[PDB]
Design a protein around this nucleic acid. Sequence first.
RNA 1: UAAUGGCCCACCAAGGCGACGACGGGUAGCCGGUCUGAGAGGAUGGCCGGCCACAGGGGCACUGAGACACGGGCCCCACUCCU
RNA 2: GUAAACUCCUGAACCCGGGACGAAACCCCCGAGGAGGGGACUGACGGUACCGGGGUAAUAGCGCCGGCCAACUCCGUGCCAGCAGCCGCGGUAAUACGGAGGGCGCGAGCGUUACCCGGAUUCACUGGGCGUAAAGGGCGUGUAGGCGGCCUGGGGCGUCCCAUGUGA
RNA 3: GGAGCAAACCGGAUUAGAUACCCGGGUAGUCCACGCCCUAAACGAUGCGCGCUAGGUCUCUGGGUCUCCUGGGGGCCGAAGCUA
Lengths: 138, 99, 208, 151, 122
Amino acid sequence: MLTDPIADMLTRIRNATRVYKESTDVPASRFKEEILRILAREGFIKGYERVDVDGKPYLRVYLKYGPRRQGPDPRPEQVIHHIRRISKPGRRVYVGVKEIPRVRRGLGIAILSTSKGVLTDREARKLGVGGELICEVW
Amino acid sequence: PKKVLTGVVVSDKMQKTVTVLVERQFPHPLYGKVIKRSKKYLAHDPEEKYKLGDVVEIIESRPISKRKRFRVLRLVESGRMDLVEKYLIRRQNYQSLSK
Amino acid sequence: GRYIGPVCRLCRREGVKLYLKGERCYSPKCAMERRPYPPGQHGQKRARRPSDYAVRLREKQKLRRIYGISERQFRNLFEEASKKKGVTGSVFLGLLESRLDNVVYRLGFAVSRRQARQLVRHGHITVNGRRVDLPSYRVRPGDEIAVAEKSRNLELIRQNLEAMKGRKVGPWLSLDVEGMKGKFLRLPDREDLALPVNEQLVIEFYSR
Amino acid sequence: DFEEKMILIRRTARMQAGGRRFRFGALVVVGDRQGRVGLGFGKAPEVPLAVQKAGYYARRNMVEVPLQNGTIPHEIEVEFGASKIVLKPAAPGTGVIAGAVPRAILELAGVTDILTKELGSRNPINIAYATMEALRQLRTKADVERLRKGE
Amino acid sequence: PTINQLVRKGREKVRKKSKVPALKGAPFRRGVCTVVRTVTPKKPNSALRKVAKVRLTSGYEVTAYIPGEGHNLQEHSVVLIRGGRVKDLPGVRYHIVRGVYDAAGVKDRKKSRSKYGTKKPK
RNA sequence: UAAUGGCCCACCAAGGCGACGACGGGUAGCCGGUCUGAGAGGAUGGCCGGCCACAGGGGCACUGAGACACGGGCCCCACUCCU
RNA sequence: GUAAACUCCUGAACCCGGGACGAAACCCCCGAGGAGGGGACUGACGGUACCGGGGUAAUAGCGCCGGCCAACUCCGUGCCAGCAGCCGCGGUAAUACGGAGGGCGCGAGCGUUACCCGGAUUCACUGGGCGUAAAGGGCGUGUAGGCGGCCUGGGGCGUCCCAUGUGA
RNA sequence: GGAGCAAACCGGAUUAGAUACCCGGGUAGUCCACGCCCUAAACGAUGCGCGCUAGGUCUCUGGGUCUCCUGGGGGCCGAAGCUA
Ligand SMILES: [Mg+2]
Ligand SMILES: [Mg+2]
Ligand SMILES: [Mg+2]
Ligand SMILES: [Mg+2]
Ligand SMILES: [Mg+2]
Ligand SMILES: [Mg+2]
Ligand SMILES: [Mg+2]
Ligand SMILES: [Mg+2]
Ligand SMILES: [Mg+2]
Ligand SMILES: [Mg+2]
Ligand SMILES: [Mg+2]
Ligand SMILES: [Mg+2]
Ligand SMILES: [Mg+2]
Ligand SMILES: [Mg+2]
Ligand SMILES: [Mg+2]
Ligand SMILES: [Mg+2]
Ligand SMILES: [Mg+2]
Ligand SMILES: [Mg+2]
Ligand SMILES: [Mg+2]
Ligand SMILES: [Mg+2]
Ligand SMILES: [Mg+2]
Ligand SMILES: [Mg+2]
Ligand SMILES: [Mg+2]
Ligand SMILES: [Mg+2]
Ligand SMILES: [Mg+2]
Ligand SMILES: [Mg+2]
Ligand SMILES: [Mg+2]
Ligand SMILES: [Mg+2]
Ligand SMILES: [Mg+2]
Ligand SMILES: [Mg+2]
Ligand SMILES: [Mg+2]
Ligand SMILES: [Mg+2]
Ligand SMILES: [Mg+2]
Ligand SMILES: [Mg+2]
Ligand SMILES: [Mg+2]
Ligand SMILES: [Mg+2]
Ligand SMILES: [Mg+2]
Ligand SMILES: [Mg+2]
Ligand SMILES: [Mg+2]
Ligand SMILES: [Mg+2]
Ligand SMILES: [Mg+2]
Ligand SMILES: [Mg+2]
Ligand SMILES: [Mg+2]
Ligand SMILES: [Mg+2]
Ligand SMILES: [Mg+2]
Ligand SMILES: [Mg+2]
Ligand SMILES: [Mg+2]
Ligand SMILES: [Mg+2]
Ligand SMILES: [Mg+2]
Ligand SMILES: [Mg+2]
Ligand SMILES: [Mg+2]
Ligand SMILES: [Mg+2]
Ligand SMILES: [Mg+2]
Ligand SMILES: [Mg+2]
Ligand SMILES: [Mg+2]
Ligand SMILES: [Mg+2]
Ligand SMILES: [Mg+2]
Ligand SMILES: [Mg+2]
Ligand SMILES: [Mg+2]
Ligand SMILES: [Mg+2]
Ligand SMILES: [Mg+2]
Ligand SMILES: [Mg+2]
Ligand SMILES: [Mg+2]
């Protein structure tokens, strides 16, 4: 019946990038819009857009990829190979700032909602804050 | 500090005593998912002012029975029968798993 | 004997001489010069490919016989550098090349290192002040490795120190000559001392 | 300039009316030990033929590898069909702590420090294939800042 | 299972059965013989193997193997068994240590000697 | 009772507890730490330091600041010797 | 197998000599039974530790050697005798039995048994599965529980950060 | 209640034997009322709810501008992905 909106968003993109799409939409949320914005202003995708489908709010998320390959599979390189909820409506996952995990040894990142706002690990390392672990990405 | 806990009346069938449902919660020692646990406290009531379904809260104190070690510090919420209804029901279940 | 037996052979198995023996193992007469092939009722026969156990081990034993020391002693020191905050390979050597019965050696006081042990366990040496006679003394940097009295005129002292006049010793142990001494300089670098052993290999064997 | 390394090599059968009729296979890698590798599986009726049949095979099929100092940058893990291999980069003076087969890759790539673990089916053939596809997917701080450095 | 399911029913540790129960946590138990006889191995071997029914200190009564180049043992031999199964003798899960008690170690072995109660000869 | 207490009496009310496992059975002294493992976990309490409980089994009180006391007292069982 | 023999050199042991630290304070006296001050007694270990001199070539074992797993030949034997942790070896050409030659590994130890974790990502939180491999309840209704969309706003139990006590 | 069929049973055959397959009989039962039983290869060997990820055609049933678009069922190929 739709348990969690965030993971569905995070997966909506996933299905859409592996079939190499232009855009995609997602039930607009003020909170969701912050996760997107991290991913957006991380350079992880092109950007989202204040869009509106059938008088119901949505966010047209514009995707990122790479150059045509050379092999028997010209199929492009990916910009965002991996993505998954760390915390889940099943079991929530809170962490201390002493226990924030490095992602792909810094290559990729992790987002987390903190008492001040949605941040990435080193952002949240710098403000020195704990929070709910929303996702790991690279 | 004397510990201060918070629960719901479920018994005023006792003279000058009330039982209260001090729920509590914490994350699981291996599985992260937080869990809620419950423990009925027998709480002394000097003039049975408090009635059923009252969300009140207790106070660590000197022993005044075999089991009473707490009193009502102060009432807060009131007429919360929905909650008594959900714990009375829990017992009502019990007479059905028997053999 | 616990390790005291036939020796200029071990290398025939190792396939590379430990230059072992002392003066003899420089002479066209070393077992490995004359007859270089694994000992026993074979070895003259060919060689099946060495498996990674065979491989990782046979470099360990080399290194072990380069200091002629027991495994119980050996095992300790290795594990120690893995605990010690640093690069295990280099450091492990940094303890071996620090044993007194070895420092005596590279200071040219004694011929084959096996000889050197005896001198040690006979008080013929005194680090700084009093005499030491522990083969396994982990000598420190800045220390003063000397030579005792019922010794300072004795034969092999004279004989063997004779050759060290002219000889340039390791870049980490300034030898004074005929004054019968030398100061252990810095804890010696990896590059500083060359051995016929890729030691990284010895890391793998143990850490199995 | 090159370098060989002869992994597991097997006799297999093919029952025909006459008798249990045989043939051989051969797993192998070529390596330069400074950043390139290749794996090749060769099959011919004879031991050394199929061996150096995997000769050409290992050399044509190839791939780079970004060993930083003496190790990979980001660890990854790979299920190949259903045969998983993990590999975390390691601080200097650590060494090839790895299976038989994974070792064959990483020494000929030039890798020294590396910590690994085979999961799933440890059948060596696929593990090799797994470990290759693993080394295909490695990236560097530059590799990312080309696909987040948006044109 | 789901984490909640997990929270509820939980994982479950499993115990190993001690394949040498007659020991009763010991390294070896003393005992006497009641019968010394020979017995054929299962498929696919064939040879008269020498065994022994041993009535124990521990109130037990178990089967044991007699390794070696022949033996002395007869019923009422004070003896000693230690853990150790024979693969092709179904049932035997204990061996008599040669050399201790009325079961003394085999004659004229020199190779692998310590495992068979023989002293060093000179 | 040094002191709160069904600790124990009296008399009154009729309640207290249980699938978040009461009640019954089996097993066990607990901890600092030890062993292991990449870890998370698993296993473990002999030396040593902290707490508990007993001194052949069971009761009981006296003395005392403190005990219901190994090398104190009383009584019952078992055991050992004196007559 | 430079292994020995033999040459040369050393000098464990062993005799000798000498010989501790651990012990300064209870006490006495100046003083004020106080500070401060000064004087005196006491070592079980122990003629030990040790330092000085004389000084002799002085015990080596146990495991393994088909594969995992490093290390091979000769003989005896003929599914016997036996080995073995799994796979298995032995029925007249056995690197697997027993003797040996040699080799390998540890060395005043080497084996064996027993026990704990490990390997066992084989109870999986990290870290697994359920069409055919073991695994979806025969199907519904619903109790407890678990979980749950978007937008304000209040509290701040969870969560988070700081200081702090505590964590002998 | 009982027409047909039909375990059990009977006879015939077939075979070395035939308590079987094929044949001549034949009772429970198979049908009804009410009440038990509650198993199954009770299979899609695929728990239920939701959101996402190419298309090709063959139908069943709706609404329209019954063109060929818009719903809901049922089948078959097949991108991607998964799969030992
Ligand atoms: Mg949610
Ligand atoms: Mg904010
Ligand atoms: Mg109580
Ligand atoms: Mg000698
Ligand atoms: Mg050797
Ligand atoms: Mg460090
Ligand atoms: Mg120099
Ligand atoms: Mg290790
Ligand atoms: Mg390890
Ligand atoms: Mg080339
Ligand atoms: Mg194989
Ligand atoms: Mg498997
Ligand atoms: Mg590149
Ligand atoms: Mg038989
Ligand atoms: Mg006899
Ligand atoms: Mg006899
Ligand atoms: Mg012998
Ligand atoms: Mg008292
Ligand atoms: Mg009272
Ligand atoms: Mg009355
Ligand atoms: Mg219980
Ligand atoms: Mg215990
Ligand atoms: Mg530890
Ligand atoms: Mg470990
Ligand atoms: Mg315990
Ligand atoms: Mg206490
Ligand atoms: Mg008692
Ligand atoms: Mg007491
Ligand atoms: Mg008392
Ligand atoms: Mg008392
Ligand atoms: Mg009596
Ligand atoms: Mg002399
Ligand atoms: Mg004496
Ligand atoms: Mg005085
Ligand atoms: Mg005085
Ligand atoms: Mg005396
Ligand atoms: Mg002499
Ligand atoms: Mg001599
Ligand atoms: Mg001699
Ligand atoms: Mg002689
Ligand atoms: Mg064996
Ligand atoms: Mg013959
Ligand atoms: Mg033959
Ligand atoms: Mg054979
Ligand atoms: Mg021999
Ligand atoms: Mg050892
Ligand atoms: Mg584990
Ligand atoms: Mg699996
Ligand atoms: Mg089937
Ligand atoms: Mg509910
Ligand atoms: Mg506030
Ligand atoms: Mg402080
Ligand atoms: Mg703290
Ligand atoms: Mg502390
Ligand atoms: Mg009919
Ligand atoms: Mg009829
Ligand atoms: Mg009818
Ligand atoms: Mg009808
Ligand atoms: Mg009826
Ligand atoms: Mg089923
Ligand atoms: Mg339902
Ligand atoms: Mg359809
Ligand atoms: Mg199909």
